Short mmCIF file of C-alpha atoms and ligand atoms in Angstrom, two decimals:
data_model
loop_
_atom_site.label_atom_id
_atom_site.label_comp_id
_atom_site.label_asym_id
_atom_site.label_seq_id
_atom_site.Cartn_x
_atom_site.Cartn_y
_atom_site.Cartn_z
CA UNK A 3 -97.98 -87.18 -71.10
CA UNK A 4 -97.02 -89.73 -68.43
CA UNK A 5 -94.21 -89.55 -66.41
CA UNK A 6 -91.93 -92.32 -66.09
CA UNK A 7 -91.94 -92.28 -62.37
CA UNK A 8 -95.83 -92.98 -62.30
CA UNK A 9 -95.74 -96.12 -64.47
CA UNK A 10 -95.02 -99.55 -63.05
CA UNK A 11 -92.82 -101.39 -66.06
CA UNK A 12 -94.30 -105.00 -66.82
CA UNK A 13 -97.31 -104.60 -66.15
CA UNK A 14 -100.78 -102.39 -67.47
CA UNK A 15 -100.52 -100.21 -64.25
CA UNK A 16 -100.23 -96.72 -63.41
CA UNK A 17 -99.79 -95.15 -60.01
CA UNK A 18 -101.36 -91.46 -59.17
CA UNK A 19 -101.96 -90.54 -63.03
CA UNK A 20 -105.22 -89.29 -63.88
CA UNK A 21 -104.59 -85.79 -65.27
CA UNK A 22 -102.88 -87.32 -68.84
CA UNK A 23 -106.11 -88.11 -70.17
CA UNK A 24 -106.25 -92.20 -71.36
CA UNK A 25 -102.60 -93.60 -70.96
CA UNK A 26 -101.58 -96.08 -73.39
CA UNK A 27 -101.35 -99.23 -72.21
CA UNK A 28 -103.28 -98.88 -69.25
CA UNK A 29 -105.49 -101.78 -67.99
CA UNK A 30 -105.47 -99.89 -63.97
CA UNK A 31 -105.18 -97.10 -62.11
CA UNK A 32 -104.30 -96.84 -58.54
CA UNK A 33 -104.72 -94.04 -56.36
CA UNK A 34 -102.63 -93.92 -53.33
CA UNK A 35 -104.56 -91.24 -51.34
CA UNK A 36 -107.36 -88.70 -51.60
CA UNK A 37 -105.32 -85.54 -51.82
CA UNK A 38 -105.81 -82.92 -54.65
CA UNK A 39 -102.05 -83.03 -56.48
CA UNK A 40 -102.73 -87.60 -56.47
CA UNK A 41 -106.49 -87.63 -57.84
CA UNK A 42 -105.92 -84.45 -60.01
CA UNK A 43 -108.06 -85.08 -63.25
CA UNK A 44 -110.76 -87.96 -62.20
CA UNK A 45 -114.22 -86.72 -61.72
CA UNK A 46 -117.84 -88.42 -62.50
CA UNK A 47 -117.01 -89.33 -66.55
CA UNK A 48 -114.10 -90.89 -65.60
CA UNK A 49 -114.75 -95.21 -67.81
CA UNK A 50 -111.89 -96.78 -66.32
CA UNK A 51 -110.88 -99.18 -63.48
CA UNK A 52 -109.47 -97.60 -60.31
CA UNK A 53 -107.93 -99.34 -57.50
CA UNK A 54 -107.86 -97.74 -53.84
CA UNK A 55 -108.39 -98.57 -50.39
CA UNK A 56 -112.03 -98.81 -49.23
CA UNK A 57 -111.75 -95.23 -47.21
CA UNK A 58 -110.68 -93.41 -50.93
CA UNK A 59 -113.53 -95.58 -53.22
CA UNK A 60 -115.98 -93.98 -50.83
CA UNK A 61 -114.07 -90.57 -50.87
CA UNK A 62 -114.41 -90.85 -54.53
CA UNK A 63 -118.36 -92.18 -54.89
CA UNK A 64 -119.52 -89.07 -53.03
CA UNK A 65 -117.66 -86.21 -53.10
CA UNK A 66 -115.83 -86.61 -56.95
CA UNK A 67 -119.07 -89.01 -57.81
CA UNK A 68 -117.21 -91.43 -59.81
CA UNK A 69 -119.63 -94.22 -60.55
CA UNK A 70 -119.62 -97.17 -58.42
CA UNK A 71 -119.00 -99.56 -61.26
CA UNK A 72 -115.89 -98.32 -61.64
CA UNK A 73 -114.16 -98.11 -58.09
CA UNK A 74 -112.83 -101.09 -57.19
CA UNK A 75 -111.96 -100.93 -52.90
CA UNK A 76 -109.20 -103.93 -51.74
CA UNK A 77 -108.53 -104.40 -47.95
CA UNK A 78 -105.41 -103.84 -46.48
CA UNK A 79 -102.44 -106.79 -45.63
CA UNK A 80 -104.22 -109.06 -47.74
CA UNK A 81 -102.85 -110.95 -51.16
CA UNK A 82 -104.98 -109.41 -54.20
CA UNK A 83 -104.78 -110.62 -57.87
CA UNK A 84 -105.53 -107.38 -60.34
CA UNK A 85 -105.35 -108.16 -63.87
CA UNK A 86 -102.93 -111.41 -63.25
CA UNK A 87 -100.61 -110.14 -60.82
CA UNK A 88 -100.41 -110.57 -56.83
CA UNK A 89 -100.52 -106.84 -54.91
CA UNK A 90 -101.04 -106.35 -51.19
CA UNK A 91 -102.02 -102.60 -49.98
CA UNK A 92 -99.92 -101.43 -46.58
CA UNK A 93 -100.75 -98.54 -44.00
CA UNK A 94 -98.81 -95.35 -45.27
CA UNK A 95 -99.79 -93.90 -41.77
CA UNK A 96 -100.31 -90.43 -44.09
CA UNK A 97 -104.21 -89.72 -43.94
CA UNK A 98 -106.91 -91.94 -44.06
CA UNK A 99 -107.45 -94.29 -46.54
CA UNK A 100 -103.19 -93.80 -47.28
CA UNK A 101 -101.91 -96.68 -48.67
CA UNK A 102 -98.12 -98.12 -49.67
CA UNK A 103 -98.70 -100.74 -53.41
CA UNK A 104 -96.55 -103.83 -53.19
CA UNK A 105 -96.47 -105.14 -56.64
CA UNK A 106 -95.11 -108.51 -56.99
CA UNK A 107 -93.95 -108.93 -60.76
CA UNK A 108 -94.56 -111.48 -63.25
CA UNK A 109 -91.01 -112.08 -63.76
CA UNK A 110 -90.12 -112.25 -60.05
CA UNK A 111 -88.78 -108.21 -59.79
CA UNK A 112 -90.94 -107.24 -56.62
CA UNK A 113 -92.12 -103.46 -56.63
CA UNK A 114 -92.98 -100.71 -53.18
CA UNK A 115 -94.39 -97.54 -54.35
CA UNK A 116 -94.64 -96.07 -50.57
CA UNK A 117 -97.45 -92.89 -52.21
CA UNK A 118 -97.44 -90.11 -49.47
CA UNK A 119 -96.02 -91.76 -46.28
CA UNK A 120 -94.46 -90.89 -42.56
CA UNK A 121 -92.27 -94.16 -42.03
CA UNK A 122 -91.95 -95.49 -39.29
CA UNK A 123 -90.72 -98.95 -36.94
CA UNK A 124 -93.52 -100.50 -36.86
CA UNK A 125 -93.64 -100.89 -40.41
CA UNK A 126 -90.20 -103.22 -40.23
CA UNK A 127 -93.36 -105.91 -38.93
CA UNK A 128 -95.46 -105.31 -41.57
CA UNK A 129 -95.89 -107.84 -44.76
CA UNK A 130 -92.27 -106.01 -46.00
CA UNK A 131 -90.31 -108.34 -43.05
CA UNK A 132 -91.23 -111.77 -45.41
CA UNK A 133 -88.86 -110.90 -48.67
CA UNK A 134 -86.72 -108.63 -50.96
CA UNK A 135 -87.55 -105.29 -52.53
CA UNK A 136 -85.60 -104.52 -55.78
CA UNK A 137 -87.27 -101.00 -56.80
CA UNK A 138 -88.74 -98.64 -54.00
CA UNK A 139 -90.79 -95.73 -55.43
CA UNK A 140 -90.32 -93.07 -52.58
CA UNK A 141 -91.68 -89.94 -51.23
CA UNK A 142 -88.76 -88.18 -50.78
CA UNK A 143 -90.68 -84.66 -49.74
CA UNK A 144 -88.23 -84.16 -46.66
CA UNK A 145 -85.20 -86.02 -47.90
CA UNK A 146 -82.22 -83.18 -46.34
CA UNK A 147 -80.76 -83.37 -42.62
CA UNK A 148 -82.62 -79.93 -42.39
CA UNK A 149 -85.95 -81.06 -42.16
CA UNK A 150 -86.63 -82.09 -38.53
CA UNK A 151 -90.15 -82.18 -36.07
CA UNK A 152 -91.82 -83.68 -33.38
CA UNK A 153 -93.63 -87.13 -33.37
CA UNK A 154 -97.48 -86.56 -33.56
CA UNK A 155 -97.75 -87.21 -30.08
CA UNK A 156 -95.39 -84.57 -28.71
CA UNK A 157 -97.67 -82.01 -30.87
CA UNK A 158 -101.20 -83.14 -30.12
CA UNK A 159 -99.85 -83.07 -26.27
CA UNK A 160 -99.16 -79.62 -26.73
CA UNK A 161 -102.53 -78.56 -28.35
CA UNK A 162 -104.59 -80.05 -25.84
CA UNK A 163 -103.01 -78.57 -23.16
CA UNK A 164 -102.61 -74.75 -24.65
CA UNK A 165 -106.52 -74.99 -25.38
CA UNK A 166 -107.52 -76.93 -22.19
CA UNK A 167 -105.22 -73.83 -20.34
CA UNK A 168 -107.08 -71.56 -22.13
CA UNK A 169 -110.52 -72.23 -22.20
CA UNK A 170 -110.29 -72.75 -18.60
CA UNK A 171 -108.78 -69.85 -17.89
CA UNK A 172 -111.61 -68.10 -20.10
CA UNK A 173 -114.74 -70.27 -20.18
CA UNK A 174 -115.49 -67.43 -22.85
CA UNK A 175 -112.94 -68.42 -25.53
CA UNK A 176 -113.73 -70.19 -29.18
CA UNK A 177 -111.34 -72.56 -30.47
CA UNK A 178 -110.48 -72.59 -34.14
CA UNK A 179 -108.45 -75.27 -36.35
CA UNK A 180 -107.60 -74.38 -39.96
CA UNK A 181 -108.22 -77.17 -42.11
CA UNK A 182 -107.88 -77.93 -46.57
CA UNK A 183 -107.58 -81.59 -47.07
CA UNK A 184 -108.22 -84.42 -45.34
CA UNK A 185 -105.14 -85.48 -42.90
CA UNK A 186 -104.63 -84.60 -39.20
CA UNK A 187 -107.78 -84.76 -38.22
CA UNK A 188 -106.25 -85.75 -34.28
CA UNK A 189 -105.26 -82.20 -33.91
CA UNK A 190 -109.62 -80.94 -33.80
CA UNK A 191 -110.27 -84.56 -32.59
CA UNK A 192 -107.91 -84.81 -29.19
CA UNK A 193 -108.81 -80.64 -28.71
CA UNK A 194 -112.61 -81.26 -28.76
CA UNK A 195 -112.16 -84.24 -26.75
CA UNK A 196 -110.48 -82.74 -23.73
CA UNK A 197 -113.11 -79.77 -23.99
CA UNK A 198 -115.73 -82.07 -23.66
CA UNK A 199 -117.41 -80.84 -26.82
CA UNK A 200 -118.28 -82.05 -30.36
CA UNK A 201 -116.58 -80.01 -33.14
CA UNK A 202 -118.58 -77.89 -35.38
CA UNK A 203 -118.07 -77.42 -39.21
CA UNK A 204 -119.76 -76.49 -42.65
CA UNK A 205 -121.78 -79.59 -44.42
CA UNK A 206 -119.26 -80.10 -46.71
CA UNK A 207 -116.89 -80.77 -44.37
CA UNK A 208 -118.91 -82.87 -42.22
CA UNK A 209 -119.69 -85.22 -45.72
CA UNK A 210 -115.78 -85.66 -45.94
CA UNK A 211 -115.37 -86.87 -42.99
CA UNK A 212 -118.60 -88.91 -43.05
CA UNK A 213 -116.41 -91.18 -45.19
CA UNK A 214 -113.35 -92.05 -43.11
CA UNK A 215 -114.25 -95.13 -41.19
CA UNK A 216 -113.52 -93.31 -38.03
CA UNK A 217 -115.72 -95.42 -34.94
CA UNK A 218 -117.84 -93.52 -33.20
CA UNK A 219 -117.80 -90.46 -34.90
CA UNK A 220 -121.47 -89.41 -34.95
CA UNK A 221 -120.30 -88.98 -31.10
CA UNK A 222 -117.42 -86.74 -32.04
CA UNK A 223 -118.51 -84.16 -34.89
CA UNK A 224 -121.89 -81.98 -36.03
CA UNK A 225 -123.54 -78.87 -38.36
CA UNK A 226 -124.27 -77.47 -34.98
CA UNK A 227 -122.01 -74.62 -34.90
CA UNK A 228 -123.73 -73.08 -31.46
CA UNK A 229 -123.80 -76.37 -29.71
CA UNK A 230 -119.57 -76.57 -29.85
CA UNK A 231 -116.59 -74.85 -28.91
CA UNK A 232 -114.13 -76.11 -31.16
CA UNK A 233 -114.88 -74.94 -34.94
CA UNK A 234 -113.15 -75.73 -38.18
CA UNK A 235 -112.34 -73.46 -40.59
CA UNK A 236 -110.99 -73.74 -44.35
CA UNK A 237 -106.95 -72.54 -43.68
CA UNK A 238 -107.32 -69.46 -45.79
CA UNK A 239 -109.24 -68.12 -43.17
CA UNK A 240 -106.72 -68.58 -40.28
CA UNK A 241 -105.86 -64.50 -39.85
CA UNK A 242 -106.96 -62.04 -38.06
CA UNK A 243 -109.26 -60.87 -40.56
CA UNK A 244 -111.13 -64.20 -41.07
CA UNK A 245 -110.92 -64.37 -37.45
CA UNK A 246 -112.72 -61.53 -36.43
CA UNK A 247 -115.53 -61.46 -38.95
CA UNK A 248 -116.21 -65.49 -37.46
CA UNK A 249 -116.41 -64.02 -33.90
CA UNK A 250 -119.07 -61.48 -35.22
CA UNK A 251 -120.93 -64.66 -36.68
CA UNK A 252 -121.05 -66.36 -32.66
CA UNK A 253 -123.98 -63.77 -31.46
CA UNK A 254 -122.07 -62.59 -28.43
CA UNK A 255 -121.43 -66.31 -27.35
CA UNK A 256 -117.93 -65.49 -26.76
CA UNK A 257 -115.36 -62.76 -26.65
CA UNK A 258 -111.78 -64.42 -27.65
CA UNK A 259 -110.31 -66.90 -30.04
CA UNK A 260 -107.69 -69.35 -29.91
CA UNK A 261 -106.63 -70.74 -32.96
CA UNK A 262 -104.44 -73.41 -34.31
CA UNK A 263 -102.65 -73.97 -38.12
CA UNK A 264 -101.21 -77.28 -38.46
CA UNK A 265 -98.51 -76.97 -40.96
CA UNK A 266 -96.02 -79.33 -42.38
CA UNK A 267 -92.37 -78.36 -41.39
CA UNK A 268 -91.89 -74.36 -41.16
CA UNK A 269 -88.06 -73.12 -40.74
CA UNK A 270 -88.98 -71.67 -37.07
CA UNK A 271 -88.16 -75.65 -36.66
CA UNK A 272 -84.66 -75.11 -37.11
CA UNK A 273 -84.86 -72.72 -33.80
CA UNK A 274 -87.60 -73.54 -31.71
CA UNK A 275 -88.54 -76.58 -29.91
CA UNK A 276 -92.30 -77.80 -29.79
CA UNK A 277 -92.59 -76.80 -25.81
CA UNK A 278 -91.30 -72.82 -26.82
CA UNK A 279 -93.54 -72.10 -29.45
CA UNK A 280 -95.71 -69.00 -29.18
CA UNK A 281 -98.44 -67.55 -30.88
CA UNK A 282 -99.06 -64.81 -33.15
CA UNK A 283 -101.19 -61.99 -31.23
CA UNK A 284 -103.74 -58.81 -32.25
CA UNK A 285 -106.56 -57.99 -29.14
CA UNK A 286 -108.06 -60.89 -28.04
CA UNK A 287 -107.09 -63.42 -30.77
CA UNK A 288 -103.78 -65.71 -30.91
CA UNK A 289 -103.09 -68.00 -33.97
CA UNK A 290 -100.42 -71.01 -33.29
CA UNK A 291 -98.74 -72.78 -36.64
CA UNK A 292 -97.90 -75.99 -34.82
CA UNK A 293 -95.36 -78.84 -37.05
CA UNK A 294 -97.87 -81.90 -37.22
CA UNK A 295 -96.12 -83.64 -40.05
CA UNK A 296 -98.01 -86.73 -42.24
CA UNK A 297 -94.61 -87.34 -44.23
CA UNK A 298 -91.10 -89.18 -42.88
CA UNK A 299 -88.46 -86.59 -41.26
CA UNK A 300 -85.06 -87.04 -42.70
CA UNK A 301 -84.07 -89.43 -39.79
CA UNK A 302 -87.42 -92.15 -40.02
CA UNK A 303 -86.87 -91.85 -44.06
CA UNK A 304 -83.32 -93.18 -43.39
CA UNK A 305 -83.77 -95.81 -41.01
CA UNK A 306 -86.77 -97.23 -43.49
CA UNK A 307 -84.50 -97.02 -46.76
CA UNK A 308 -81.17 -98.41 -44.69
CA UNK A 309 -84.02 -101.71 -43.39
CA UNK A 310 -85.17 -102.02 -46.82
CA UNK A 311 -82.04 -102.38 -48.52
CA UNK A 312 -83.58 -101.75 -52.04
CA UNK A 313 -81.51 -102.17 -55.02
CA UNK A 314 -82.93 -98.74 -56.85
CA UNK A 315 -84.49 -96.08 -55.21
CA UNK A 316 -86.83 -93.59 -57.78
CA UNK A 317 -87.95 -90.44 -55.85
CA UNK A 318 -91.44 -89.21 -56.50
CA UNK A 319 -91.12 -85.86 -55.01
CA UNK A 320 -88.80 -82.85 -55.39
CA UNK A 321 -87.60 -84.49 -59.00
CA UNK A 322 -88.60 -81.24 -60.91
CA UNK A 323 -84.69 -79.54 -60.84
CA UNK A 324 -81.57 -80.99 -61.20
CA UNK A 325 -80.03 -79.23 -57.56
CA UNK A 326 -82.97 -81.49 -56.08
CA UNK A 327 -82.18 -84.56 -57.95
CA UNK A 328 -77.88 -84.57 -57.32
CA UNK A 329 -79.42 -83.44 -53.65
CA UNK A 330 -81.30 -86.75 -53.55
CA UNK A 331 -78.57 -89.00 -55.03
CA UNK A 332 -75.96 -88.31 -52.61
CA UNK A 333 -78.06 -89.05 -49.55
CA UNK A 334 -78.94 -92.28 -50.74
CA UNK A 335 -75.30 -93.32 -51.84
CA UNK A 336 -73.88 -92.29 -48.54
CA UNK A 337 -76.83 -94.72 -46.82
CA UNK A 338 -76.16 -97.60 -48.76
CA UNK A 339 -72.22 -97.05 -47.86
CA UNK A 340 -73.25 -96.39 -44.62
CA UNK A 341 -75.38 -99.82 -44.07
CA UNK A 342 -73.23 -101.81 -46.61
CA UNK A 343 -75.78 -102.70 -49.01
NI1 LIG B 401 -100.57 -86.50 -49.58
#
């Protein structure tokens, strides 16, 4: 059954709910994002309407193989009437294909369900800027003054220059990036780039990212493992085990690795800054867990709530114990005191 936090009240709509089998009173499903824990339950039998952005419906046509007649793509800061009532899709600047659900309500109550999201400023200049919010569904995953990271930019400026160091240090040396979902694909992307290389992967991996709308990327990526120097790697494999057995795959081609685990936030963050970090080390291969986040610090999630000024706030994430919950409460009571609202 349901939860209440993935219904949207006056309306036929559900957000993220496909593993509850038929939900009563359902006319449409949205799906935020093409991660695992969102899409959990559709597959190819799947009989009912689903509404993404255009990068998930093709996500969903060819690797889940939901049929076509059923995924219904809508392009992003533009109006949309679904089943009598006006939405508009926003960036989420999470993965691709990540989108934020304005729902504006039959009775004049307008709706944000933000999915998976980083926040950030330039989303005060978005579609949001024209009018009032009076319910915010929010991904609260790092809502406590603990979590804290780098932008994306501080941490793909790091990467690029630990591998270019390396590799031209040792023309000899294989890069690696650890990879599970789709999401930070800049950390292989800027790497390869300043290697002057295409990255190499399995076909299955390649497919995925067939479907992301990223421009020139036939330029960028192949199945030709030999040709590159970057490789990707599913994440379990990131340890010196899986390591060294993929080095004895490489026929002699090279004789070190250097490879890279992006994480989400890791408590060495509460230590270390981003320019500090060092790797983990056996022989001649070194593993670095770097902190590229795809959802809001503490700090951005504040400053978006405290624009905002929504009336109710319903947290999407952490909501399973009550510690998390009365955790959750208090932040957002002290920012609305804070900001007067
Ligand atoms: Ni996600």
């Amino acid at each position: 059954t349901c939860p209440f936090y993935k219904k949207i009240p006056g309306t036929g709509f559900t957000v993220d709910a496909f593993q509850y089998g038929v939900v009563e009173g359902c006319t449409a499903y949205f799906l935020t994002h093409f991660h695992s824990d969102h899409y959990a339950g559709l597959s190819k039998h799947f009989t009912f309407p689903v509404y993404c952005s255009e990068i998930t419906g093709n996500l969903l046509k060819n690797k889940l193989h939901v049929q076509e007649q059923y995924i219904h793509p809508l392009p992003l800061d533009t109006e949309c009437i679904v089943n009598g009532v006006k939405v508009v899709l926003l960036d989420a600047n999470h993965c691709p294909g990540a989108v934020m659900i304005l729902f504006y309500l039959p009775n004049g109550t307008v709706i944000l369900h933000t999915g998976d999201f980083r926040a950030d400023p330039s989303m005060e200049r978005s579609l949001l800027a024209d009018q009032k919010v009076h319910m915010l569904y929010l991904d609260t995953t790092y809502c406590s003054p603990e979590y804290t990271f780098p932008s994306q930019q501080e941490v793909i400026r790091f990467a690029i220059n630990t591998a270019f160091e390396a590799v031209t240090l040792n023309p000899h040396a294989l890069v690696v990036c650890g990879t599970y979902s789709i999401g930070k694909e800049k950390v292989f992307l800027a790497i390869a780039d300043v290697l002057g290389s295409k990255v190499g992967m399995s076909q299955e991996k390649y497919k995925t990212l067939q479907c992301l709308n990223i421009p020139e990327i036939n330029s960028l990526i192949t199945t030709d493992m030999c040709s590159s120097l970057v490789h990707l790697l599913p994440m379990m494999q990131i340890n010196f085990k899986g390591l060294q057995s993929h080095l004895k795959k490489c026929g002699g081609k090279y004789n070190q690795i250097l490879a890279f685990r992006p994480t989400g936030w890791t408590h060495s963050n509460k230590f270390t800054r981003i320019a500090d970090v060092i790797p983990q080390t056996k022989g001649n291969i070194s593993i670095y867990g770097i902190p590229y986040s795809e959802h809001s610090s503490y700090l951005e999630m504040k400053r978006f709530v405290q624009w905002l000024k929504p009336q109710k706030i319903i947290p999407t994430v952490n909501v399973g114990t009550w510690k998390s919950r009365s955790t959750m409460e208090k932040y957002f009571r002290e920012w609305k005191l804070e900001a007067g609202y």
